[PDB]
Structures are given as C-alpha cells and as structure tokens.
Enzyme design. Structure first.
Site, short mmCIF file in Angstrom:
data_model
loop_
_atom_site.label_atom_id
_atom_site.label_comp_id
_atom_site.label_asym_id
_atom_site.label_seq_id
_atom_site.Cartn_x
_atom_site.Cartn_y
_atom_site.Cartn_z
N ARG A 38 0.42 -1.08 0.29
CA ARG A 38 0.18 -0.33 -0.02
C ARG A 38 0.92 1.58 -0.19
O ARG A 38 0.60 1.82 -0.81
CB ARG A 38 -1.34 0.17 1.48
CG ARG A 38 -2.21 1.06 1.50
CD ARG A 38 -2.81 0.63 2.80
NE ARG A 38 -3.56 2.31 3.01
CZ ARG A 38 -3.44 3.20 3.77
NH1 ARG A 38 -2.85 2.67 5.36
NH2 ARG A 38 -4.16 4.10 3.94
N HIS A 42 0.38 4.16 -2.79
CA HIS A 42 -0.33 5.19 -2.29
C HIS A 42 0.83 6.88 -3.24
O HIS A 42 0.65 7.06 -3.17
CB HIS A 42 -0.34 5.48 -1.49
CG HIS A 42 -1.59 4.88 -1.09
ND1 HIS A 42 -2.98 5.55 -0.25
CD2 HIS A 42 -2.45 3.83 -1.37
CE1 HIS A 42 -4.04 4.86 -0.06
NE2 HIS A 42 -3.84 3.91 -1.17
N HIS A 163 -5.63 -6.63 -3.82
CA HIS A 163 -6.08 -7.05 -1.96
C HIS A 163 -6.00 -8.60 -1.46
O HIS A 163 -6.95 -8.66 -0.60
CB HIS A 163 -7.81 -6.46 -2.41
CG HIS A 163 -7.64 -4.92 -2.38
ND1 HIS A 163 -8.83 -4.54 -3.29
CD2 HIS A 163 -6.48 -3.41 -2.07
CE1 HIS A 163 -8.50 -2.88 -2.92
NE2 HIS A 163 -7.18 -2.85 -2.32
N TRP A 179 -9.40 -8.74 2.59
CA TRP A 179 -10.76 -9.52 1.73
C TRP A 179 -9.91 -10.78 1.39
O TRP A 179 -11.60 -11.59 0.55
CB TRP A 179 -9.98 -8.66 0.17
CG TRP A 179 -9.75 -7.42 -0.43
CD1 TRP A 179 -11.45 -6.86 -0.58
CD2 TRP A 179 -9.61 -6.14 0.61
NE1 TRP A 179 -11.59 -5.56 -0.88
CE2 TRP A 179 -9.91 -5.34 0.14
CE3 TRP A 179 -8.58 -6.87 1.70
CZ2 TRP A 179 -9.25 -4.28 0.66
CZ3 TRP A 179 -7.38 -4.81 2.22
CH2 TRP A 179 -7.87 -4.20 1.31
N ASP A 208 -14.92 -3.24 -5.57
CA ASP A 208 -14.39 -4.19 -6.00
C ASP A 208 -14.46 -4.96 -6.90
O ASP A 208 -14.55 -5.59 -8.10
CB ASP A 208 -14.10 -5.20 -4.92
CG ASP A 208 -12.36 -4.54 -3.91
OD1 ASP A 208 -11.19 -4.18 -4.54
OD2 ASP A 208 -12.75 -4.91 -2.73
C1 HEM Z 1 -9.01 0.02 -7.57
C2 HEM Z 1 -8.68 0.92 -6.31
C3 HEM Z 1 -8.12 0.39 -5.21
C4 HEM Z 1 -9.41 1.22 -3.91
C5 HEM Z 1 -10.62 1.38 -4.14
C6 HEM Z 1 -8.77 1.08 -2.21
C7 HEM Z 1 -9.17 1.05 -0.86
C8 HEM Z 1 -7.99 0.68 -0.35
C9 HEM Z 1 -8.84 0.52 1.11
C10 HEM Z 1 -10.30 1.19 1.49
C11 HEM Z 1 -7.45 0.04 1.98
C12 HEM Z 1 -7.91 0.12 3.66
C13 HEM Z 1 -6.32 0.33 4.44
C14 HEM Z 1 -7.31 0.76 5.29
O1 HEM Z 1 -7.94 1.34 6.47
O2 HEM Z 1 -6.07 0.43 5.54
C15 HEM Z 1 -6.64 -0.72 0.89
C16 HEM Z 1 -5.59 -1.29 1.81
C17 HEM Z 1 -4.65 -2.13 0.78
N1 HEM Z 1 -4.70 -1.56 -0.26
FE1 HEM Z 1 -5.71 -1.01 -2.03
N2 HEM Z 1 -7.01 0.30 -2.99
C18 HEM Z 1 -7.24 0.32 -4.26
C19 HEM Z 1 -6.50 -0.73 -5.95
C20 HEM Z 1 -5.12 -1.31 -4.54
C21 HEM Z 1 -3.67 -1.29 -5.44
C22 HEM Z 1 -3.36 -1.58 -7.08
C23 HEM Z 1 -2.95 -2.38 -4.54
C24 HEM Z 1 -2.65 -2.41 -4.97
C25 HEM Z 1 -1.83 -3.21 -6.35
C26 HEM Z 1 -3.78 -2.53 -3.31
C27 HEM Z 1 -3.58 -2.31 -2.39
C28 HEM Z 1 -3.34 -2.07 -1.25
C29 HEM Z 1 -2.40 -3.38 0.78
C30 HEM Z 1 -2.06 -5.01 0.11
C31 HEM Z 1 -3.93 -3.04 1.36
C32 HEM Z 1 -4.06 -3.61 2.59
C33 HEM Z 1 -3.23 -2.79 3.75
C34 HEM Z 1 -3.50 -3.23 4.77
O3 HEM Z 1 -3.31 -3.70 4.65
O4 HEM Z 1 -2.60 -2.68 6.15
N3 HEM Z 1 -5.34 -1.73 -3.66
N4 HEM Z 1 -6.98 -0.49 -0.51
#
Ligand code: HEM
Ligand code: NA
Length: 250
Positions: A38, A42, A163, A179, A208
């Site tokens: 993340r 980001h 995710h 997820w 998603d």
């Molecule tokens: C497609 C649009 C996306 C949206 C709307 C989105 C949104 C989110 C949100 C709301 C979270 C929760 C963060 C938290 O509360 O800790 C999250 C976590 C995360 N996102 Fe995304 N994301 C997207 C795409 C991606 C992409 C492209 C990646 C990397 C390839 C990614 C990797 C992650 C990971 C690994 C987490 C887990 C973080 C953790 O466990 O601390 N996401 N995302």
C-alpha cells in the site's frame, strides 16, 4: 521501448541490492508486506500524465502527503523503514519505497517484479484526491487508472488483486476487514472471493464489486480466478508500469 532507464553508479546498484536484502528480512520478520505494498502503490498512483505531477518520487516521506486522508496509517510504514533507509543514504526515497513494494510482493509468494533504479526525490507532493475512491465504480476506476495514470483495463483488474494482501482498518480508511482468508499470502484468492459473493468474515469494497458488473473487467476477474499464472504475469506487468509512472519515459 517506452522507457529509457538512467545510468546509475555501481555503488548505487550495490546499495539497491543490500537494501533489497534488508527489506526482505524486515518485511518478512515484521509481517508488514500488505502495508508496504500500500505504501508503494499510494506513492506511485498519484501520477497524472496530463501535468506529469505526482508519481513514485519519494513524496510519501513528506508529512503533508502522509496527512492525506487516503494515506492514513502509511506514516507507520515510513517510520518502520527509516532505520534501513538511514543505512543507504545514497538511495532516493523514491526508489526505496518502490523497492519496498516489489519486495512486499516477493516475500508473500508473488511474482518477481523487475526493478530499475534512478528515480529522483521531487520536492512537491501531488495534490490530495488523485487516488481511487473505494465507494465509486468502473467509470471512476477508468478515470483514475486510465486517464490519470495511463494504465489499461487489464492493469486495473490485475492491480486490484493486490487486495489479496492485507485488510481494511476502521481507523485508517474506515472500512474494516480482509479480502481473503490468507492476507499474508500473495495469490489469486481475491478474485475467487469476489466471484463467490460476499461471505462472513471477509470484506468487499464497492470498487472491488465494480469489477464484477463491468463487461470488460469481468472476463479478467474470471481469468485470474481460474489461472493464477496468468494473474501473476499480468500483475507483474501492471506493477512494473505503476512503479515507473513518470519515470524514465522515452
Ligand atoms: C482499485 C482501487 C483501490 C481502492 C478503492 C483501494 C482502497 C483500499 C482501502 C480503502 C484500503 C484499506 C486501508 C486501511 O483501512 O488500512 C486498502 C488497503 C490495501 N490496498 Fe487498496 N485500493 C485499491 C487498489 C489497490 C492497489 C492497486 C493495490 C496494490 C497493488 C492495493 C493494495 C492494498 C493493500 C495491500 C491493502 C492492505 C493494507 C494493509 O493491510 O495494511 N490496493 N485499499
Ligand atoms: Na491472500
């Protein structure tokens, strides 16, 4: 041939490799690969091709970008990595955070993503609001990944499979839950859980679910749910492009 990568010193290349090894140990030892993915995503995903502002240029170290709502919690990631960064002053933060994202995918079982050094640390963060909104749908995903970042529909679906790692936290995004049942394993489980519908113990965001109803995204979900190898290949290509937005363009 869309890239022309810069020449870096042998010392720069040696520091990349030693930092890669330290990151592999730390990220595995501290079980923080999802947070580190993340962090890298980001960092890179703010790029807008129209102004060539944003992108993977180190600006997540900047407290003002850390304070963006979408980056809640990434200050933890920055602080966890700083003891390693202090050992590699030659490296840009830009390269260092993208290396962390590549290592995060590796240590959780994912594909080996190529890494090319030489990103500059730029002084100004992007404006807030470039990253995708979890409550919006396919039109918004194409605006963010497509019109801003320059990425394809395939890239959108493959990158959403990130995710497969980690979870949402009520104090960070406000969503809560993982997820997948194995949030430290990089695999195609995300797409299988999407196809099966909602289930107790697991989370799906509206962004998603947009993958399932769109007639172009859905065949890709189907493909990745059935074929992990195809998912890993397309994820590798999409992560590589993401990690290099605005960098080394021919
Ligand atoms: C497609 C649009 C996306 C949206 C709307 C989105 C949104 C989110 C949100 C709301 C979270 C929760 C963060 C938290 O509360 O800790 C999250 C976590 C995360 N996102 Fe995304 N994301 C997207 C795409 C991606 C992409 C492209 C990646 C990397 C390839 C990614 C990797 C992650 C990971 C690994 C987490 C887990 C973080 C953790 O466990 O601390 N996401 N995302
Ligand atoms: Na998983």
């Amino acid at each position: 041939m869309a890239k022309s990568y810069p020449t870096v010193s042998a010392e720069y290349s040696e520091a990349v490799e030693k930092a890669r090894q330290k990151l592999r140990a730390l990220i595995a030892e501290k079980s923080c690969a999802p947070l580190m993915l993340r962090l890298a995503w980001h960092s890179a995903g703010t790029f807008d091709v129209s102004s060539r502002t944003g992108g993977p240029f180190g600006t997540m170290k900047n407290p003002a970008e850390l304070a963006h709502g979408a980056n809640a919690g990434l200050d933890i990631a920055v602080r966890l990595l700083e003891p390693i960064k202090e050992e590699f002053p030659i490296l840009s933060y830009a390269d260092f955070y993208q290396l962390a994202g590549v290592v995060a995918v590796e240590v959780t079982g994912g594909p080996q993503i190529p890494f090319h050094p030489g990103r500059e640390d730029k002084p100004q963060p992007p404006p807030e609001g470039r990253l995708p909104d979890a409550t919006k749908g396919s039109d918004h995903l194409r605006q963010v990944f497509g019109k801003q970042m320059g990425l394809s529909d395939q890239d959108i679906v493959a990158l959403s499979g990130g995710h497969t790692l980690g979870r949402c936290h009520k104090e960070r995004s406000g969503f809560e839950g993982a997820w997948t049942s194995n949030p430290l394993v990089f695999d195609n489980s995300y797409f299988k859980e999407l196809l099966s519908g909602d289930k107790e113990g697991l989370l799906q965001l509206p962004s998603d679910k947009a993958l399932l109803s769109d007639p172009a995204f859905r065949p890709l979900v189907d493909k990745y749910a059935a074929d992990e190898k195809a998912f890993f290949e397309d994820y590798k290509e999409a992560h590589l492009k993401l990690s290099e937005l605005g960098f080394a363009d021919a």
